[PDB]
Design a protein around this ligand. Sequence first.
Ligand SMILES: [Ca+2]
Ligand SMILES: [Zn+2]
Length: 392
Amino acid sequence: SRANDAPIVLLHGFTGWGREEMFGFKYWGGVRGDIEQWLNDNGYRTYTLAVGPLSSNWDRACEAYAQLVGGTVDYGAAHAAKHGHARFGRTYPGLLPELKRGGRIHIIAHSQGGQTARMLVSLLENGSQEEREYAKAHNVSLSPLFEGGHHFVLSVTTIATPHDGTTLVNMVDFTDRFFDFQKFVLKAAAVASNVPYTSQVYDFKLDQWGLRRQPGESFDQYFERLKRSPVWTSTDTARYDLSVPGAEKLNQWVKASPNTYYLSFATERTYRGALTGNYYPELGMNAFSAVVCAPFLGSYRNATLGIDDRWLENDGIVNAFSMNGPKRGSTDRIVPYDGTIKKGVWNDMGTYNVDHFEVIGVDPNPLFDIRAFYLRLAEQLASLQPHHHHHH
Ligand SMILES: [Ca+2]
Ligand SMILES: [Zn+2]
């Protein structure tokens, strides 16, 4: 039963927004309802983070930290100089000031949020040697996130995360297809992309890059500006971290903490053609994933890059193979769940038959008991022991 009372913190992917955005239409729950509310109602204290959807995992980590303890976002001086964006971002009140006094949390992340979560846990525990060295050499201030020694995260649970990247980034037309998912979520929320709404609606939180939707500019128009901006052309981007090479790079330094439990859930919404060996999208998958993305994922091979048949199964957006945990460029160990959740390693909870967006309720799927899924997940997280004694 319950063994800890750590609060749960939700974290989105390359799409996502705060509770007040999209006129209330939740990322965590979508057409289903409000996941956070379900958990709160059932006795699992839960909060939601909202960071930059298209920003680099690093940026997102920095934003999350600030968002969790309060203060002004500090991306790190070395980092900011390297990538040419602002050092300081937006300020936050802090959702959980208790973290500054011994508290702990469980992070439940979806999609790219799993990469963010892992990076956050890595920075909190080990800081950034680079950031630390730069401060000493240049006399600049240093964010507590880069010092090391924080123990805030009891667990990290990922759902449909591209731990090893996604080959979707290899599509010749990825640029346009990816932003189309930005239009999709807008459509799910009943928001048009060809309208210059005066209300913010969906804030990409690109304060470091000094980009924002301007008066008279629809999302469609904005997206075209973004495609040409550094949030799309730089290596300090979600675009980069999402790619197979990018994820590998990340995995080479973002390691599982021995003091944290990691759980992984994979998603699949495809079938295998008996003659092609390819995978095809199942009935029920959103049109934005099914037309050109799912088929590309289910048929794209590249032997030099090491994309083989194992990678074809997918959830319309990410290759299932890349979800159970980091593998490419990683020293992290993955163990198939057996009824016991082990600390400091990836507990592969298996593959669920739900698509990238049906898993968080953004796309309907009446056959998927979303409430049960999340309640069972919470139940599991609340049963983890912050201190596991060794035994026979
Ligand atoms: Ca569906
Ligand atoms: Zn950055």
